[PDB]
Design a protein around this nucleic acid. Structure first.
Ligand SMILES: Nc1ccn([C@H]2C[C@H](O)[C@@H](COP(=O)(O)NP(=O)(O)OP(=O)(O)O)O2)c(=O)n1
Ligand SMILES: [Mg+2]
Ligand SMILES: [Mg+2]
Length: 430
DNA sequence: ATATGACGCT
DNA sequence: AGCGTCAT
């Protein structure tokens, strides 16, 4: 009734860079612009593994994780850029630096939560309120929203995409109740205006295009973002949720893409997000737990409370490399030399981090994977990180894992290791 | 034989 | 502390 909270208290956006690693390489190398192209790492095995794909190459069926040799069969004109390789491993510094370019521009507009190397959530609630007094009941021109889609519109009584976009926007803006400064729909619209400006600034100042979702929480914003990629933004209002969720496969909602989402489908015998509404909160808690049940009950009604955390810096700094198949490390010397390669890159990045961001890591986490174990980590151990010194860090890492070696011979390492992973954590101000 | 990062559970 | 889930 009147006491039902509707999850319309915030304006939250999720910005995601379109094929981000490709854009970085394309800005640097104009010959790659506006062409089917992909970013590859390690040219030797099958041409290297593809980790980013331009939208031109996506039209041929090229995808992430594909071998480049196989992508060329689908797309013979595919152009490739290689990831930097340092100390025998992929080095992502160029993309980290490009990411900082984007995050700093976004930070001028509102509070940012860095969600990945190329995505950030944005809490626009405060900026919207401020803009609502500076605007003074002025109606919002469609010209302030030139790349915005209104999910669910047009409805009711044009055969080209831009024509549909405009008609839905016009239908949205004509219905808009501008005098009520507390209309959630008006707030979202103002949020979208600000995101148009933020996205124009990113493009003007870096050359990078991105997509965005604008809604009332993080889950809807993230979902909204992908509805109209690339170089577009989508507003998902509270009212759009029943129709949108009615055919929305459960696995598309953030955090339901894995085992939990699969057991929702199997235990309840449903396919789409909106079908969750027919169960009571207690029923959902009995099947999935107190916290998963509460979360699902509200989320299938468009409601979610996870805050945009004010954090632009990662909380851990990590270095890892896999050694698949025949390349698995099988002698003590190999294990030690690779720990040293990881420790050396880690020291470089930590020292950079200590000068840029006034903090030091205090704990080193060492993670390995053993041959035949299909888990991400076979084993995790920690030690103190007191000195940004690569030889000390690699030696201590070796110390805390060496007893895992079941080999009778000193030369050897068994079982062979298919991953080494060094992660600096537990930062303190400095 | 596809490098990372955030976080929950116990 | 150490392992498990989910994600880009
Ligand atoms: N599994 C993954 C996913 C992404 N990435 C990297 C490469 C991507 O350019 C970058 C951004 O990830 P992403 O947003 O999921 N995809 P990308 O930005 O390339 O394309 P879009 O679909 O977002 O337009 O992280 C990775 O290295 N391994
Ligand atoms: Mg992206
Ligand atoms: Mg992303």
């Amino acid at each position: 009734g009147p006491h039902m909270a509707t999850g319309q208290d915030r304006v939250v956006a999720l910005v995601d860079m379109d094929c981000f690693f490709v854009q970085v390489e394309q800005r640097q190398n104009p010959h790659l612009r506006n062409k089917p192209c992909a970013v590859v790492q390690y040219k030797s095995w099958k041409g290297g593994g593809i980790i980013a794909v331009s939208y031109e190459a996506r039209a041929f069926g090229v995808t992430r994780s594909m071998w480049a040799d196989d992508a060329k069969k689908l797309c013979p004109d595919l152009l490739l850029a290689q990831v930097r390789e340092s100390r025998g491993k992929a080095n992502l510094t160029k993309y980290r630096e490009a990411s900082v370019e984007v995050m700093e521009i976004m930070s001028r507009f509102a509070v940012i939560e860095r969600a990945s190397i190329d995505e950030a959530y944005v809490d626009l609630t405060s900026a919207v309120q401020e803009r609502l007094q500076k605007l003074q009941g002025q109606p919002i021109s469609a010209d302030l929203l030139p790349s915005t889609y209104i999910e669910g519109l047009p409805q009711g009584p044009t055969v080209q995409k831009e024509g549909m976009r405009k008609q839905g926007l016009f239908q949205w803006l004509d219905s808009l109740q501008i005098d009520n400064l507390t209309s959630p729909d008006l707030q979202l619209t103002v949020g979208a205006v600000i995101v148009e400006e933020m996205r124009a600034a990113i493009e003007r100042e870096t050359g990078f295009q991105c997509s965005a979702g604008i809604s009332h929480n993080k889950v809807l914003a993230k979902l909204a973002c992908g509805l109209n990629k690339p170089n577009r933004q989508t507003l998902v209002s509270h009212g759009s949720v029943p129709q949108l969720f009615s055919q929305m496969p459960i696995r598309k909602i953030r955090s339901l893409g894995g085992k939990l989402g699969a057991s929702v489908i199997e235990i309840l015998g449903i396919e789409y997000m909106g079908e969750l509404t027919q169960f009571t909160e207690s029923q959902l808690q009995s099947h999935f737990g107190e916290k998963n049940g509460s979360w699902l009950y509200a989320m299938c009604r468009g409601i979610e409370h996870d805050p945009v955390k004010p954090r632009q810096l990662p909380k851990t700094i990590g270095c890892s490399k896999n050694f698949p198949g025949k390349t698995a490390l099988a002698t003590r010397e190999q294990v030690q030399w690779w720990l040293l390669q990881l420790a050396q890159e880690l020291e470089e990045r930590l020292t950079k981090d200590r000068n840029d961001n006034d903090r030091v890591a205090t704990q080193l986490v060492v993670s390995i994977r053993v041959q035949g174990d299909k888990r991400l980590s076979s084993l995790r151990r920690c030690c103190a990180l007191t000195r940004y010194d690569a030889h000390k860090m690699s030696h201590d890492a070796f110390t805390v894992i060496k007893n895992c070696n079941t080999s009778g011979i000193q030369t050897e390492w068994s079982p062979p290791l298919t991953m080494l992973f060094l992660c600096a954590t537990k930062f303190s101000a400095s």
